Amino acid sequence: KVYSRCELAAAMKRLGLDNYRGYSLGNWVCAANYESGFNTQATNRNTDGSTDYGILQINSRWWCDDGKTPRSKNACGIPCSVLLRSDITEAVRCAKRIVSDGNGMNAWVAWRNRCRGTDVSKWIRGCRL
Ligand SMILES: [Cl-]
Ligand SMILES: [Cl-]
Ligand SMILES: [Mg+2]
């Protein structure tokens, strides 16, 4: 599923992402925009044999188990396939776990490079949440 911007913003608000551990909602929408283009089925295979999965491009070394990645920690305690669901609930739970660590949203390269320093509140403008 490719979400629209406001659809995603509403779904993320519903699941408690707005101002979760210091990151306002616009940060989460911005990150999803740049990481995946709002696409729950996005996948990108990395140089290290890990794959990034779903709308927030969550990585299979550290966070989810895909049975294909050396040295995998599976810190979210999930199969990576749950991160390709049209329902974002499992991805949001895992994202909250990720962002709890000292890296914060720097876990998401596209957030670090594309969203950090920008007016992220623009991502929720005009939306009914
Ligand atoms: Cl915001
Ligand atoms: Cl949670
Ligand atoms: Mg990416």
Author numbering: 1 to 129
Mind quoting what the paper says about this structure?
Lysozyme purified from duck eggs (DEL) has long been used as a model antigen as a counterpoint to the enzyme purified from hen eggs (HEL). However, unlike the single C-type variant found in hen eggs, duck eggs contain multiple isoforms: I, II and III. Duck lysozyme, often strain and isoform unspecified, has been used to advance our understanding of many immunological phenomena including: antibody-antigen interactions; immune tolerance; complement activation; germinal center B-cell affinity maturation; T-follicular helper cell differentiation; and, most recently, to dissect self/foreign discrimination during emergence from B-cell anergy. We recently used a combination of mass spectrometry and X-ray crystallography to unequivocally delineate sequences of all three Pekin DEL isoforms (DELs -I, -II and -III).
Here we report the high-resolution structure of the remaining isoform, DEL-II. The DEL-II structure comprises two C-type lysozyme molecules in the asymmetric unit (chains -A and -B). Although the overall fold of DEL-II corresponds to a classical C-type lysozyme, as expected, in one of the two molecules of the asymmetric unit a surface loop of the B-chain molecule (residues 67–73) differs significantly from the A-chain molecule and from DEL-I and DEL-III, which are typical of the classic HEL fold. Centrally located within this loop is one of the four residues that together distinguish DELs -I, -II and -III, position 71. Arginine 71 in DEL-II (glycine in DEL-I) mediates interactions between the chain-A and -B molecules: the guanidinium side group of the chain-A molecule stacks against the guanidinium side chain of Arg97 of the chain-B molecule, hydrogen-bonds the side chain of Asp101 of chain-B, and it’s Nε atom coordinates an adjacent Cl− ion (distance ~ 3.17 Å) held at an intermolecular interface. In contrast, the side chain of Arg71 in the B-chain molecule is not observed at all in the electron density, consistent with this residue being part of a loop that packs differently within the crystal lattice compared with the A-chain molecule and with other DEL structures (loop 67–73). The neighboring residue, Thr69, contributes the only direct hydrogen bonds from this loop (B-chain Thr69 O atom) to symmetry-related A-chain Arg14 atoms Nε and NH2. These DEL-II B-chain molecular contacts and mode of crystal packing are not employed in the DEL-I crystal where position 71 is replaced by a glycine residue, which, in the context of the DEL-I crystal, contributes no main-chain hydrogen bonds to crystal packing. Negative peaks in fobs-fcalc difference maps covering the search model (DEL-I) clearly indicated the absence of a substantive side chain at position 37 (in both chains -A and -B), consistent with glycine at this position.
